[PDB]
Amino acid sequence: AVEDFHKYHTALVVRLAGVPPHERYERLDRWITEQLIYRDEWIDALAEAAGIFKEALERNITTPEEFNAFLKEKGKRAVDLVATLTNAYIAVLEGDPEAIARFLGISLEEVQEIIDAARKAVKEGRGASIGIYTKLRELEE
């Protein structure tokens, strides 16, 4: 389930962001989750969240707010669990932007563009990864 988290998470985020499917997003997503670990609490959180995103993929959830409505149907536990992972993604970006740049083959300035899109997406309730993937799509093309 821990390994499956980035498969379900990326698949939903790509669907809700509307960007074309591409292997770069799953690759970055696995890199981010591994930065989180390098804690068993995050392992437990990713395993539990993996089923939440799996069920969202199996429902007619096509917008970020349809996902938020789904989380609130799931309960306050699901809402807060995703919010915690969202802010964890932000901390990982803001924590080692130099490694992210070398990993994606971009400059530090372009990593700051990803940080800005992610933080903006969080404040508008869309989660961090929608901003990351949309910005990454624009950077590569």
Q: Give the separation between CA 111 and CA 134, rounded to whole angstroms.
A: 13
Is 64 in contact with 127 (CB distance < 8 Å)? yes
- Tell me the domain boundaries of the chain: 2-140
- Token pair listed for 106: 């971009």
* Sequence-distant contacts of 29-32: CB under 8 A, at least 24 apart: 29/129, 30/6, 31/103, 32/89, 32/92, 32/93
Q: Give the separation between CA 46 and CA 85, rounded to whole angstroms.
A: 8
Amino acid type, 24: R
Listed residue (53, 73, 58, 43) closest to 13, CA to CA: 53
H helical segments located in the chain: 2-17, 23-37, 40-57, 64-74, 76-95, 97-104, 108-123, 128-140
- Token pair listed for 49: 């969240």
DSSP secondary structure code for residue 63 in this structure: S
Is 97 in contact with 111 (CB distance < 8 Å)? yes
